[PDB]
């Protein structure tokens, strides 16, 4: 599968929901192990999905997904600590809407990661410790978060999981930073908190592409961008929109209308052609530039399970992965393979 076939380029994952890694799906558990060899929770260790409101833990999902790993020897990396989304307004917020204060975070902080990253410490190889820091418009997301904590946010979010996994590869993610202008805000952050001697290790790019956008050639410069800041690159979410596109009135965009979905009965063998071309020419680049990536995940692996279907217009039918609904490989995993099969060497 393409775990082994990638090999000595970089590791295979997948995002796995909470079903997935209970282990009651042989098919899948069949597909996972031969294809993958590192996994992400795409939901269960998220701040507002493991805890409820008033702080309560409740570890069944995210106990099962780090079981799963283990009983695979899968490469598990812990999604996320410290971010803006799928967090509950009460980390940040008195009942009357005022926040608390920077001190009253920083302890809530120090507790979330002592305990999380500390259950799993040795287990998970990996952490995203920040996801999303840098806003679309290129400045810090004015997140709470940041309105609160300003920078530090991000460099006690890393120096504290240092001192809890000093084992864990700690990684830094965004969406989008595979494109100018985010990129380099991006660079910047990221150069002046390691002045500061901030503890980090791999830049995550999130790779949620679009079956046109953005070109091979952004992309080529992020890699050799983040790589130069001596961290490793890992892609982290990979998935192909193949859906009419939203991101280009700005109201009703995001309104479920019948032209925004038009593949409901199945993805015609020209949509299946350019989708396996675009996951070949992406994987072409991944090829290239090896020496500088150590991962890369797909975020899900079958089509039926993708977030893709509902966000971000709730109810479509897309088809953003390597396998179908049935749980076939797609013709892109088939050129996925012929890319390392047909590899040329000495
Ligand atoms: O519809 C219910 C539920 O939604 C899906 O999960 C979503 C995640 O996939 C999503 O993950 C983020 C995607 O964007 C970034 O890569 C980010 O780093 C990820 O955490 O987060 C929102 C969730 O609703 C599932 O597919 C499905 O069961
Ligand atoms: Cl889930
Ligand atoms: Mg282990």
Known sequence: GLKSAYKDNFLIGAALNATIASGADERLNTLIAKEFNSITPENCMKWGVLRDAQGQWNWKDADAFVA???????????????????????????????????????????????????????????????NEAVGDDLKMRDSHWYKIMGDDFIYNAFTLANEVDPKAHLMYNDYNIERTGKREATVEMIERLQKRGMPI??????????????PIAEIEKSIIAFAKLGLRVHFTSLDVDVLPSVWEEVSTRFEYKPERDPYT??????????????????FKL???????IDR???????????????????????????????????????????????????
């Not at 598990?76 to 799928?86: E, P």
């Not at 009965?265 to 020419?281: T, V």
């Open 296 to 346: 890369a995940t797909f975020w899900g692996v079958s089509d039926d399970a993708s977030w893709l279907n509902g966000f971000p217009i709730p109810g479509r039918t897309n088809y953003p992965l390597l396998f179908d609904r049935k749980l076939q490989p797609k013709d892109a995993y088939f050129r996925l393979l012929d890319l390392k099969r047909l590899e040329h060497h000495h």
């Open 201 to 214: 290790h791999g830049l995550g790019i999130q790779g949620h592409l679009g079956i046109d956008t953005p």
């Open 286 to 292: 991944f090829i290239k530039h090896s020496d500088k």
């Open 68 to 130: 799963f790993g283990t009983k695979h020897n899968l490469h598990m990396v812990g999604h996320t600590l410290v971010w803006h989304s799928q967090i509950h307004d009460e980390v940040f917020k008195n009942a009357d809407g005022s926040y608390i204060s920077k001190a009253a975070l920083q302890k809530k902080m120090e507790e979330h990661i002592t305990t999380l990253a500390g259950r799993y410490k040795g287990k998970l190889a990996a952490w995203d410790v920040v």
């Open 265 to 282: 009965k199945g993805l015609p063998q020209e949509m299946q052609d350019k989708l396996a071309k675009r996951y070949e020419d992406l």
